[PDB]
Amino acid sequence: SRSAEIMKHGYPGFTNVRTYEDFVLSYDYKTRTAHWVCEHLTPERLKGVDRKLCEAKPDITFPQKFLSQNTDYKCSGFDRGALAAAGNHRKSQLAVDQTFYLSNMSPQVGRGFNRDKWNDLEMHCRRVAKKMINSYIITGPLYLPKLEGDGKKYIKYQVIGDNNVAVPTHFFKVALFEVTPGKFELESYILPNAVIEDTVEISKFHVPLDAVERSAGLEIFARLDPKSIVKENGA
Amino acid sequence: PSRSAEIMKHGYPGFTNVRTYEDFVLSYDYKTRTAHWVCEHLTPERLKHAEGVDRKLCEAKPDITFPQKFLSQNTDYKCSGFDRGALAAAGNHRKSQLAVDQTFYLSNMSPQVGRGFNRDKWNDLEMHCRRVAKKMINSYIITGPLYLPKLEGDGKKYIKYQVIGDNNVAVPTHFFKVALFEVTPGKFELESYILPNAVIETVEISKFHVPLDAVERSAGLEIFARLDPKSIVKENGAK
DNA sequence: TTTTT
DNA sequence: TTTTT
Ligand SMILES: [Mg+2]
Ligand SMILES: [Mg+2]
Numbered sequence: 027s028r029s030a031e032i033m034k035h036g037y038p039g040f041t042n043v044r045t046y047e048d049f050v051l052s053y054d055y056k057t058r059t060a061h062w063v064c065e066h067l068t069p070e071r072l073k074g075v076d077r078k079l080c081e082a083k084p085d086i087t088f089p090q091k092f093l094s095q096n097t098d099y100k101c102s103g104f105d106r107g108a109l110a111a112a113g114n115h116r117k118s119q120l121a122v123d124q125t126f127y128l129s130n131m132s133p134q135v136g137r138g139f140n141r142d143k144w145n146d147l148e149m150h151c152r153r154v155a156k157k158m159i160n161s162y163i164i165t166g167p168l169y170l171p172k173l174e175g176d177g178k179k180y181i182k183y184q185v186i187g188d189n190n191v192a193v194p195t196h197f198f199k200v201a202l203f204e205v206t207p208g209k210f211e212l213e214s215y216i217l218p219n220a221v222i223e224d225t226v227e228i229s230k231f232h233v234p235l236d237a238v239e240r241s242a243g244l245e246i247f248a249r250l251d252p253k254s255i256v257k258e259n260g261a
Numbered sequence: 262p263s264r265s266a267e268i269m270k271h272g273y274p275g276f277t278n279v280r281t282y283e284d285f286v287l288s289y290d291y292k293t294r295t296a297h298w299v300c301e302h303l304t305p306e307r308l309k310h311a312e313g314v315d316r317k318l319c320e321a322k323p324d325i326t327f328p329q330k331f332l333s334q335n336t337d338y339k340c341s342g343f344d345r346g347a348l349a350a351a352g353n354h355r356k357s358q359l360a361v362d363q364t365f366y367l368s369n370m371s372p373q374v375g376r377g378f379n380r381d382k383w384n385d386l387e388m389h390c391r392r393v394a395k396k397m398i399n400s401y402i403i404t405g406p407l408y409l410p411k412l413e414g415d416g417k418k419y420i421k422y423q424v425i426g427d428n429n430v431a432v433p434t435h436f437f438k439v440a441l442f443e444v445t446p447g448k449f450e451l452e453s454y455i456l457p458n459a460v461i462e463t464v465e466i467s468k469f470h471v472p473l474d475a476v477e478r479s480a481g482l483e484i485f486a487r488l489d490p491k492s493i494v495k496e497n498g499a500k
Numbered sequence: 501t502t503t504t505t
Numbered sequence: 506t507t508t509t510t
Contacts, residue, residue, distance in 0.1 A: 039291070041277045055275075055481030056408075077501085091478055105503055113501060134503095141502045149501080169292070171424045179429065182421040185410050190418065240330055243291025316506090344508050352506055373508095380507045388506075 032066040036249035048121040049110040055092040057192035059132040062166035063110040067155040075119050085127040094128045098187025107134025109165040111148045132167045133193040138221030147228050151201050159204040167194030194219050198238045211257040232259040268302040272486035284360040285349040291331040293431035295371045298405035299349040303394040310355045321345050324366040333367045337426020346373030348404040350387045371406050372432040377460030386466050390440050399443040406433035407479045433458050437476045450495040470497040
């Protein structure tokens with residue numbers, strides 16, 4: 027099974043899972059965006075298909091009362107940011123078309139984030155993947171607390187459109203790279219959903235995996251054992 | 262077991278991190294470190310106290326069948342200004358010591374305003390549900406936290422809530438409670454409520470009625486799916 | 501290659 | 506009945 031290949035190293039969680047052609051997604055009825063998406067890449071799999079034949083549409087195999095709509099994002103000020111990236115899925119027109127499901131979208135800052143630094147992170151994972159045995163990428167939104175002036179910690183985020191789609195404060199990305207058979211490089215990033223200077227290197231957004239777990243309420247690469255991790259966030 | 266099937270007869274609100282305790286079912290949210298929902302089932306017979314039971318020798322503690330890193334602890338609540346508010350109320354579970362002890366799992370707790378809410382109007386709503394249930398054949402109650410949007414001083418909508426303790430336990434902005442009362446066999450009265458997690462003044466609990474649909478949308482849950490609307494004879498006091 | 505009323 | 510040192 028493709029899906030069982032994609033999810034070899036663990037399910038981050040089991041809420042409202044859909045297995046699409048080339049990735050697995052978990053959808054959150056409350057925020058109207060994904061809990062997470064998992065992707066599996068090989069050099070083989072990263073190689074006629076056109077993407078502007080694609081239009082974002084709701085995945086209606088989820089109940090309608092829990093759907094986002096293009097009308098939620100329209101004039102929001104945010105892009106429809108695709109967590110499982112179209113560029114990662116080009117072995118078929120279907121596979122790429124499903125990356126355009128709104129279940130796979132989060133409201134993302136456009137210029138200075140989704141169109142730049144977040145895009146740079148995606149391109150980095152793709153390029154590293156092209157010279158690795160297997161690559162596993164888990165992406166998801168976050169809603170992080172901030173201490174404010176009264177000394178109290180608050181989670182605050184905008185919601186948009188009539189369906190109140192959540193605007194994540196941050197996004198995480200965790201990549202597992204099989205370098206030598208049975209052995210892995212692990213890269214864990216948290217980036218703010220905000221304008222980021224192009225000056226900043228992606229490694230500045232490294233965080234320990236445990237931080238991603240706690241913040242997202244997910245078990246990332248549980249089925250995997252830490253002996254087989256040879257490199258962690260560069261080290 | 263067969264008990265959990267009686268409890269969940271009219272459907273699962275969701276399937277995330279479900280635990281079946283002896284007399285109620287709970288769904289646990291790893292992000293908020295509190296419940297998504299709890300579902301309870303009462304009857305007049307089950308509201309008779311059993312002998313030897315006692316709620317005085319009960320202490321709040323985590324349910325460690327969830328992974329440690331997603332638990333809340335008593336230290337998260339300690340000196341926060343909020344109560345450990347039981348969603349499935351101790352008072353609903355009368356038939357054994359374990360059944361009531363389990364309502365003291367922290368998975369069943371939300372940070373709640375005490376004076377003016379948990380100890381007052383929220384408790385008034387709980388007692389009201391037990392009272393109605395002594396006169397009904399079957400009663401199902403679904404309870405949970407909400408985190409609701411507020412139009413701020415720009416023109417943008419925001420969800421904002423406090424998190425407490427080192428584990429960042431969410432302080433809900435509101436709580437819903439939906440009660441399905443079987444008034445005659447196969448015929449139900451439905452009552453849906455949303456209250457703010459705040460001091461509530463004289464205010465009748467019926468001021469907090471909202472359509473079921475509004476609770477489903479806010480909570481991202483499917484409440485009482487296996488219930489045919491033909492069978493509903495009353496909705497928040499009407500019809 | 502990422503997207504926008 | 507609810508809870509908190
Ligand atoms: Mg993107
Ligand atoms: Mg209480």
